[PDB]
Design a protein around this nucleic acid. Structure first.
Lengths: 128, 180, 35, 185, 201, 103, 147
RNA sequence: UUGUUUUCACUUUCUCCCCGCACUAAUGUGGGGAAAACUGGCUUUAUUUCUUCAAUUAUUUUUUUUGCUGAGGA
RNA sequence: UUGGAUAAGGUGCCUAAAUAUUCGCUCAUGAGAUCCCAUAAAAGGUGUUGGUUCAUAUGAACUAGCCCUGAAAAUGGAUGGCGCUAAAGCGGA
């Protein structure tokens, strides 16, 4: 409720929706970057291994990109140490292009912003 | 399959109810079926109509199952009926609608282009309600009766439209407009 | 999967009957209030 | 709005026609017929043992479907006009000065005088093959006639506007050169 | 586009579409010679285009009309100016493209028998509703003071007869060539006959 | 006769530009008998030669060629973008280039 | 009442300027779009521009709807019922061999010649060139003899 | 005060008949009737390569031809 | 800096990219043509299409899209220019 309310105030400047398993796996594998550095000195680094994942989470037994996907899809007990550990994805512009960034995805006229629900997988894998 | 001709409408049916409250221990369940560009777009339109006709929204409505109950045969040929309501720049006006195509998906959508071309009514101003099936003889429209006649014909004097392959700029001589 | 498709057909035909009865009630109310 | 319009024009006995690419060439009694109707989209069906023309218009919208009616009644009407000449009822009028006529050169290049007293020259022509000549029954009457319907009618049209005067109220001065009725030979 | 030069018969061609295509060809570097510009047709009524040209005619530099827009009355010059207004003539490359164009009224001497090409993208029969109103550039130019329409028509009819004579020569040449081909086919060896027959030669 | 060609003709159109802005890294090229993107894609990776003549000899030869290759199509009307070893001189727009069979 | 000979002769002699009736049962080959190159049947008509064109299993085209703008139909026609389905389509096509009666006209022959000419390998291309060369030899030989 | 259940009226045709009897856009039409149903749907049986096995989504695996780039030197 | 892909906006030429596809509307004897933006109103509209209400395929009334009149200013003149009408205009897809 809290984050949905705080995101509704920013809805006209974003588009969001259901990620689904294949898309979360694609995002983590080919666009996943991780903060390996020390606290407040994070030094963004691509995953490329499981050593840093284990170093930050091995004592908390969620070591491995296997486990990170196993955990990000079904929001289990560790989302703090996954989302915050994961660097913000820097996506490419869409391959085929946006429809209208100025208008909502939900208006009858073509538009982009809003909740695409399950329709964001195509946009993500087009932007990836 | 040709993507240029096709629109982007499919079937869906999603069932839910308003939230059971302490005041309303056993609320009733309700449903309604429309098609639009997307399932999310149709859900938003359904919630808008729910807010306009009754008092409920996402804050007081939930859904408890989702399915895609497609048509019996999408390759059939039909004649259905809906009810149109729209607004102009100075008022509001209503009527009915019926048209022929293969399936409800495009049966909903062939109307918007005509409305925009004639009355400049943007899609945010038209409301379509209560899809059912119409008869073929009961139609009092001029054009639609000859659609299911026993036998009919007319020529094909439309202008040619060639490919980008063969739309060659410089021609040996002037083409004609008879064909066949 | 004959049983599964039969159950799906039953649910869809219940939907169709509900739509038909809703149409009937809409028409009855419109006819009643037309005069 | 529908997709076909047509007029099953009835061909009388005394006429024989041949259609070719919206250029119908016909033979009656006084002469032959042809017409340049290339402005309008027209298709034509013809028969000659059972007769009757069928002038049709494909994708008939009332935007231009008022033209097939014009051409079709016109077609039957030139048929009638060439078979039997048409006669409008033209009468010269003169409140004070009886109209002076100088019918020079056989119905071609007529001259008009004695209209309000100008005593000058006024000559108006007509399309060849159409007569507008004095009816012997009454002097002030001219029995217009000719070959075809348009042929007679434009001649009945151009003549009225030939002698107009100025600064005289026509509600009180009813001067003119009138045309009243229509008949046949 | 790739030919040494393209000769375009402007008869029955809409002025704007023809000018746009020709200007694109000049910019791409293809030399263009336009003939029979006096049969160019313009959409809209003849009176409408006459009003437009009168409005253009009344427009000149107040201080000295010599530097005012040289109006030009020949249909060939009208087409040339319309094409010039379609390309960047103020630059060197645009000036070269403009000079790569020749415009003629009728068909002058070195255009009797080089193939006159036609671009269907600018044809009246394809780019104008039949029930709508159009004009003729030769008639409009004569109305605005060309006084050469009739001479071009007489030259054109003489050229029509002249070209018809040698077309009548060419048809008999071709129909004797085809009949000598018919007999020469059976003097070729059968295996070479089969390939020509099945390839339609 | 002699002097085989075994290449396709092309015309040097403008640079890879927008309105009032160019990018001379890519040059637009039109090909003799291509008018759609779907077969303009056929000539991708093929070598491209711009052969021109100089006023005086440079290696006992009055002819100089600059090489390049077509990277991808441009638009959907059979126009390609070609990248050359150097930048195509802007004195050479509308000139002829050879789209070669090799590779 | 019935008249025979005059109607029978005037059906052919009327030379009506428009032909290729759009009745159900005609054949079609598309002019514009991804499907230009397939042979289908005009099942019925839905409106002014959109029409129903469906192929045969031997030809192999699924159900489609195409605007009248892109069309070029054929002259053949069969006598199926209005509701006949894919079980009867494959029977009625082979009942009269709908394809055989078309590929002999001028346009059909030209299309077949082009189809077998573009697919020509380099060897048969050179064979065509050599046949033309020998034909030209005979051309000039008998042309000189004809003097 | 919901359900449930009940009646007729619907479709194919190059079918055929009669009247205007050729008035058809046609190798038919306007009207009134008979036909089976070669339309169609329904259930089965061995097979999906004689023939469709579509589209969308979810989950996977390849593939044709090619542009650009080569930091580093453990 | 090198490649790729896009945003806003465009794809008839100027100008890179659609004389693209698909569905309607409009003829203007001063058509119209991208927010700010470069003016336009009251009053008239049996053209087009679709309506609504009523009186037995028969007549009305309105309604609203485009177009028209209303609509006159001084150097010559500006949808940015050319020009565009089976739009290169307007409303969609």
């Amino acid at each position: 409720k809290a984050t949905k309310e705080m995101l509704k105030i920013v809805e006209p400047y974003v588009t969001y929706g259901y990620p689904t398993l294949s898309t979360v796996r694609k995002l983590l594998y080919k666009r996943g970057y991780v903060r390996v550095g020390k606290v407040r000195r994070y030094a963004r680094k691509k995953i490329q291994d499981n050593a840093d994942i284990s170093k930050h989470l091995g004592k908390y037994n969620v070591h491995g990109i296997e486990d990170m996907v196993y955990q990000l899809y079904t929001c289990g007990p560790v989302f703090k140490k996954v989302n915050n550990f994961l660097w913000a994805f820097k996506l490419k512009p869409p391959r085929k292009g946006f429809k209208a960034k100025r208008h909502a995805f939900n208006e009858p006229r073509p538009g982009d912003w809003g909740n695409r629900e399950a329709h964001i997988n195509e946009l993500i894998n087009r932007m990836i | 399959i040709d993507n240029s001709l096709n629109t982007n409408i499919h079937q869906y049916h999603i069932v839910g109810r308003a939230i059971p409250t302490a005041k309303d221990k056993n609320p009733n369940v309700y449903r309604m079926c429309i098609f639009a560009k997307n399932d999310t777009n149709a859900k938003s339109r359904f919630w808008y109509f729910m807010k306009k006709i009754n008092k409920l929204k996402k804050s007081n409505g939930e859904l408890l199952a989702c399915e895609q109950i497609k048509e019996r045969f999408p390759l059939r040929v039909k004649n259905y009926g809906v009810l149109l309501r729209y607004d102009s720049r100075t008022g509001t006006h209503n009527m009915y609608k019926e048209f022929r195509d293969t399936t409800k998906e495009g049966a909903i959508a062939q109307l918007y282009s005509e409305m925009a071309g004639r009355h400049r009514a943007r899609a945010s101003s038209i409301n379509i309600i209560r899809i059912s099936e119409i008869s073929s003889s009961l139609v009092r429209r001029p054009h639609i009766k000859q659609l299911l006649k026993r036998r009919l014909r007319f020529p094909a004097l439309h202008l040619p439209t060639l490919q980008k392959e063969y739309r060659k700029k410089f021609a040996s001589k002037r083409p004609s407009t008879y064909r066949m | 999967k004959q049983i599964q498709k039969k159950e799906l057909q039953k649910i869809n035909h219940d939907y169709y009957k509900g739509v038909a009865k809703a149409v009937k009630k809409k028409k009855k109310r419109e006819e009643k209030k037309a005069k | 709005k529908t997709i076909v319009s047509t007029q099953k024009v009835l061909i009388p006995e005394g006429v024989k026609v041949a259609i070719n690419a919206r250029k119908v060439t016909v033979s009656g009694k006084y002469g032959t017929l042809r017409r340049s109707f290339r402005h309008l989209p027209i298709d034509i069906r013809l028969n000659k043992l059972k007769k009757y023309i069928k002038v049709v218009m494909w994708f008939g919208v009332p935007d231009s479907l008022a033209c097939i009616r014009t051409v079709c009644t016109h077609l039957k009407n030139m048929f009638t006009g060439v078979t039997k000449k048409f006669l409008y009822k033209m009468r010269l009028v003169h409140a004070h000065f009886p109209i002076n006529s100088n019918i020079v050169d056989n119905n071609t290049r007529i001259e008009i005088r004695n209209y309000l007293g100008e005593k000058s020259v006024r000559f108006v022509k007509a399309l060849p093959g159409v007569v507008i000549e004095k009816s012997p029954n009454v002097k002030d009457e001219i029995y217009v006639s000719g070959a075809d319907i348009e042929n007679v009618s434009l001649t009945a049209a151009l003549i009225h506007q030939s002698v107009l005067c100025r600064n005289k109220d026509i509600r009180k001065f009813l001067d003119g050169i009138y045309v009243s009725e229509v008949t046949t030979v | 586009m790739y030919k040494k030069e393209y000769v375009i018969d402007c008869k029955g061609h809409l002025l704007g579409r023809l000018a746009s295509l020709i200007a694109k060809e000049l910019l791409n570097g293809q030399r263009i010679v336009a003939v029979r510009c006096e049969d160019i047709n313009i959409s809209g009524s003849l009176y409408r285009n006459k009003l437009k040209y009168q409005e253009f005619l009344r427009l000149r530099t107040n201080t000295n009309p010599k530097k005012g827009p040289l109006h030009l009355r020949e249909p060939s010059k009208i087409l040339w100016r319309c094409v010039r207004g379609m390309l960047p003539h103020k630059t060197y490359k645009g000036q070269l493209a403009l000079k790569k164009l020749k415009v003629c009224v009728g068909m002058p001497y070195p255009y009797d028998k080089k193939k006159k090409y036609v671009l269907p993208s600018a044809l009246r029969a394809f780019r104008l509703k039949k029930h709508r109103r159009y004009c003729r550039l030769g008639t409009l130019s004569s109305r605005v003071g060309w006084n050469y329409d009739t001479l071009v028509k007489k030259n054109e009819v003489l050229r029509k007869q002249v070209s018809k004579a040698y077309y009548k020569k060419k048809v008999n040449n071709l129909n004797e060539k085809k009949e000598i081909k018919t007999e020469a086919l059976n003097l070729i060896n059968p295996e070479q006959r089969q390939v020509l027959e099945n390839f339609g030669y | 006769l002699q002097a085989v060609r075994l290449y396709e003709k092309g015309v040097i159109l403008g640079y890879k530009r927008s309105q009032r802005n160019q990018d001379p890294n890519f040059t637009l090229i039109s090909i003799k008998n291509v008018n759609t993107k779907k077969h303009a894609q056929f000539y991708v990776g093929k070598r491209v030669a711009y052969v021109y003549r100089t006023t005086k000899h440079h290696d006992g030869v009055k002819i100089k060629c600059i090489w390049g290759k077509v990277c991808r199509t441009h638009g959907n009307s059979g126009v390609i973008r070609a990248k050359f070893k150097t930048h195509i001189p802007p004195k050479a727009f509308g000139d002829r280039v050879r789209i070669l069979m090799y590779p | 009442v019935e008249l025979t000979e005059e109607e029978k002769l005037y059906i052919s002699k009327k030379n009506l300027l428009f032909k290729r009736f759009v009745e159900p049962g005609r054949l079609c080959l598309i002019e514009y779009g991804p499907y230009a190159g397939k042979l289908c049947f005009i099942v019925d008509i839905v409106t002014i521009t959109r029409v129903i064109v469906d192929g045969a299993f031997i030809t192999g085209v699924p159900r489609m709807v195409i605007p009248l703008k892109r069309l070029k139909l054929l002259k053949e026609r069969i006598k199926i019922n209005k509701n006949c389905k894919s079980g009867f389509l494959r029977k009625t096509v082979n009942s009269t061999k709908v394809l055989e009666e078309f590929n002999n006209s001028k346009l059909g022959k030209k299309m077949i010649i082009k189809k077998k000419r573009d697919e020509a390998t380099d060897f048969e291309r050179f064979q065509v060139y050599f046949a033309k060369r020998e034909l030209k030899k005979k051309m000039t030989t008998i042309k000189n003899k004809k003097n």
